[PDB]
Design a protein around this ligand. Structure first.
Ligand SMILES: CC(C)(O)C1CCN(Cc2ccc3nc(-c4cccc5n[nH]cc45)nc(N4CCOCC4)c3n2)CC1
Length: 842
């Protein structure tokens, strides 16, 4: 390539956090052929997008305005303020009006048509043929009782988005030669054997074993392991999972390559070790640690793919199977029904994952029948998109490329609004794809190229994985590189400014944590050399400003060094404040960010995403539970940034403020705090109403996810009454925190039913039922969260909680009770669970 084409790739590598052009950790050319493979879908999408709409990235929606927002417009008129520096005029607008209509009306109501309505303070433009009700920033102000401040400026130059130019009937067998490890020390002498499995989607097709020998650094066999499954019967996506028990080590090898050719030849595969099932266990990647890892030597030498109506009772049986939740196992009898009646099953889109779980993937004849069955997709295509359903077909239980492609097919109809909701979860599912190039990877690749907000989050999501996943970093980096070669030069510049800032902060953050000790503590010296380092950074060359990674409409400017400190936690996070880099911002207020090391913010990212999903469900049913899923982005390896919620305090501090003696908790204290932080009596009532809704929402959401038993410490509250949970980094009993300080705000001092307390029970039930109409979605979002989020879990046991919690297979009146009962446990326990929480530690 060109010299400047090489300067460009090293730019990409720094942005990616991994060198894709590197070839040290490969035993074929899947990754290279995938970089090549993704050139086309990147270029099709870059060619097709409107430059103007892409430059301005209008954030918008087709969902109807929820009821609670229609009661806020009882005049059928919405007010907009249009600013210019020396002046600004308010305009009454119809909810159906297009931004152009109001621009055209702003020239008339005065007493050259090349300007745009941008939001004051944010990189957010109101443009294109959509009614202003449909703009998400309009609905944001209508919900939180704010004004719609806008400024008439110049449309941004699409020139800045420039994309730089482009240039057998035999049975299967494997020969195990041996395993070698440099240093083996663990425990007194044990035995060691290899287990070879033919896998397709978490089903083992066939399994063989070696004879066990004593565990020492070299151990040979030279055995030919003869499987009963034939070569022709082998399906695309099939793995050869090789395992060492004494389970210590594992490695995998695809048996059909990306060119549909059977795998042949010699391979020495470096293997991953187990921590003293999960998505990592499926990876075609080999351990990059060639010096200290265990390896396996193997040999292949063996292309492929070259009327009647159902009776009444059996239909009842079938339909019953289809009705069961995703976590319900299928009997051999169950699977046989589903397959035999496959044409009737096909008529029910909710049967698809069960149906596709009844397929003998290890019989060519049956997979062909399955492909034939899939060609008459009339029912599936016409079905209304069910994100839950679609997700199930993307998990670890489906390796088939065509079964997964129908899933991605349905996704194509998601609007940007919705893709943003499931982006992270979708990114995590790439991990279940047998091959690097996949329908789904192309989908994320093209949806992000199409819209800058999806592109921005796509960037950070893929970049969190690359940084802390040797198992999938190579796959994910090939994809990030594909995206970055299409996003345009503004964004590359924008990402650079962002990466530079987090790298620069990463170094400060780590030295302070290390100079820092735990309990003690802080420590003036530490907080003084924090301000020293930061003043060193500003000049120079920390970026003049950068887009805020968890909120890319926001430009953070230079730091307010005096407002920056080191937090009072044993893990030493940096409380940073930045000046807003938009001078046309209507508020002087600073951008506050907590930069943390070395927790892993992936779990929080995930949880926060589910929470935003729950809010979106409630929005349909016209409910607003006042959740605060603040910004949280994993930026690198154990390094990430967190949005600071303005005027928020910890529930524990509000209790400690009264003399702070460990565990002595007083009921009246929270209501005392709120009333004190209230500018009027009016604002106090609003805070109580804000608390009743928020507390209600966190109660429901936190219970379903089984993260309800929390310390007072990780529950926070804004001075405006907004309660919100924090810190899922870590992950007697209580279902959720509903303590007597909370019940006193609502006006209850132990078994007394007040009007606010009645409200809480009401909203809870409404909120809990609304969630249950999405049981299948939640279950699947949660099953996936565990497999791609946590190091080792039970694919059986660990998930069930949510089945119980969601009250699967129970009528709405049993569910009303079931939750109202959980409320009574909270009131029964009182302060007891909170008391033990702080007690056991010292
Ligand atoms: C005075 C002093 C010592 O500087 C502080 C005292 C405490 N106070 C409130 C406080 C205390 C601890 C906090 N931990 C977190 C946090 C820590 C670890 C993992 C987390 N995942 N998600 C949030 C996490 N997040 C906070 N949020 C975020 C929301 O917006 C307000 C600050 C936060 N906030 C700030 C000033």
């Amino acid at each position: 390539m060109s010299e400047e084409s090489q300067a460009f790739q090293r730019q990409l590598t720094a942005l990616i956090g991994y060198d894709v052009t590197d070839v040290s950790n490969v035993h074929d050319d899947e990754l290279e052929f995938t970089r090549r493979g993704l050139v086309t879908p990147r270029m099709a999408e870059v060619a097709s997008r409107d430059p103007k709409l892409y430059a301005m990235h209008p954030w918008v929606t087709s969902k109807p305005l929820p009821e609670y927002l229609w009661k806020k417009i009882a005049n059928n008129c919405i007010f907009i303020v249009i600013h210019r520096s020396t002046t600004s005029q308010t305009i009454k607008v119809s909810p159906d009006d297009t931004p152009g209509a109001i621009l055209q009306s702003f020239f008339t109501k005065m007493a050259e048509q090349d300007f745009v309505l941008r939001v004051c303070g944010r990189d957010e433009y109101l443009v294109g043929e959509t009614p202003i009700k449909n703009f998400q920033w309009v609905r944001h102000c209508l919900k939180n009782g704010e004004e719609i401040h806008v400024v008439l400026d110049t449309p941004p130059d699409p020139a800045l988005d420039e994309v730089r130019k482009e240039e057998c009937d035999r049975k299967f067998r494997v020969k195990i030669r041996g395993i070698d490890i440099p240093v083996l020390p663990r425990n007194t002498d044990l035995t060691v054997f290899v287990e070879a499995n033919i896998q397709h989607g978490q089903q083992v097709l066939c399994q063989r074993r070696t004879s066990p020998k004593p565990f020492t650094e070299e151990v040979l066999w030279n055995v030919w392991l003869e499987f009963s499954i034939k070569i022709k019967d082998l399906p695309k996506g099939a793995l050869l999972n090789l395992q060492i028990y004494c389970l210590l080590y594992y490695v995998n090898l695809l048996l059909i390559d990306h060119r549909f050719l059977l795998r042949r030849g010699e391979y020495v595969l470096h293997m991953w070790q187990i921590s003293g099932f999960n998505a990592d266990k499926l990876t075609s990647a080999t351990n990059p640690d060639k010096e200290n890892s265990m390896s396996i030597s193997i040999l292949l030498d063996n292309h492929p793919i070259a009327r009647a109506e159902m009776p009444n009772q059996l239909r009842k049986q079938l339909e019953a199977i289809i009705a069961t939740d995703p976590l319900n196992p299928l009997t051999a009898e169950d699977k046989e029904l589903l397959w035999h009646f496959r044409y009737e099953s096909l008529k029910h889109p909710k049967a698809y994952p069960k149906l596709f779980s009844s397929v003998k993937w290890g019989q060519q004849e049956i997979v062909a029948k399955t492909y034939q069955l899939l060609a008459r997709r009339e029912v599936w295509d016409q079905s209304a998109l069910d994100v839950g359903l679609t997700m199930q077909l993307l998990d670890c239980n489906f390796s088939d490329e065509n079964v997964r492609a129908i899933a991605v097919q349905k996704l194509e109809s998601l609007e940007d609004d919705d893709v943003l909701h499931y982006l992270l979860q979708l990114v995590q599912a790439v991990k279940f794809e047998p091959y690097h190039d996949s329908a789904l990877a192309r989908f994320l690749l093209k949806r992000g190229l199409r819209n800058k907000r999806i592109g921005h989050f796509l960037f950070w999501f893929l970049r969190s994985e690359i940084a802390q996943s040797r198992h999938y970093q190579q796959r994910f980096a090939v994809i990030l590189e594909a995206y970055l070669r299409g996003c345009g030069t503004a964004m590359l510049h924008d990402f650079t400014q962002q990466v530079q800032v987090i790298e620069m902060l990463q170094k400060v953050t780590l030295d302070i944590k290390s100079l820092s000790a735990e309990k003690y503590d802080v420590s003036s010296q530490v907080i003084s050399q924090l301000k020293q380092k930061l003043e060193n950074l500003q000049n120079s060359q920390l970026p003049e400003s950068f887009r805020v990674p968890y909120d890319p409409g926001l430009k953070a400017g230079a730091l307010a060094i005096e407002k920056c400190t080191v937090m009072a936690s044993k893990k030493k996070p940096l409380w940073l404040e930045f000046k807003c880099a938009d001078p046309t911002a209507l508020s002087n207020e600073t951008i506050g960010i907590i930069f943390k090391h070395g927790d892993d913010l992936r779990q929080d990212m995930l949880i926060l995403q589910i929470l935003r999903i729950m809010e979106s469900i409630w929005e349909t049913e016209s409910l607003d539970l006042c959740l605060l899923p603040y910004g949280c982005i994993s930026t690198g390896d154990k390094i990430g940034m967190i949005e600071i919620v303005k005027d928020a305090t910890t529930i524990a501090k509000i209790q400690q403020s009264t003399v702070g003696n460990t565990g002595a908790f007083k009921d009246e204290v929270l209501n005392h705090w709120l009333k004190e932080k209230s500018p009027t009596e009016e604002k106090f009532q609003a805070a109580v109403e804000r608390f009743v809704y928020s507390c209600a929402g966190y109660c429901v959401a936190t219970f379903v996810l089984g993260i309800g038993d929390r310390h007072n410490d990780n529950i926070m509250i804004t001075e405006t009454g907004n309660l919100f949970h924090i810190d899922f980094g870590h992950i007697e009993r209580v279902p959720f925190v509903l303590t007597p300080d909370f019940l006193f705000v609502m006006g209850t001092s132990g078994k007394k039913t007040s009007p606010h307390f009645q409200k809480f029970q009401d909203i809870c039930v409404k909120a809990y039922l609304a969630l249950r109409h999405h049981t299948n979605l939640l279950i699947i979002l949660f099953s996936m969260m565990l497999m791609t989020g946590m190091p080792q879990l039970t694919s059986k046991e660990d998930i069930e909680y949510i089945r119980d919690a969601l009250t699967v297979g129970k009528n709405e009146e049993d569910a009303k009770k079931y939750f109202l009962d959980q409320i009574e446990v909270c009131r029964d326990k009182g302060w007891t669970v909170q008391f033990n929480w702080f007690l056991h530690l010292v």
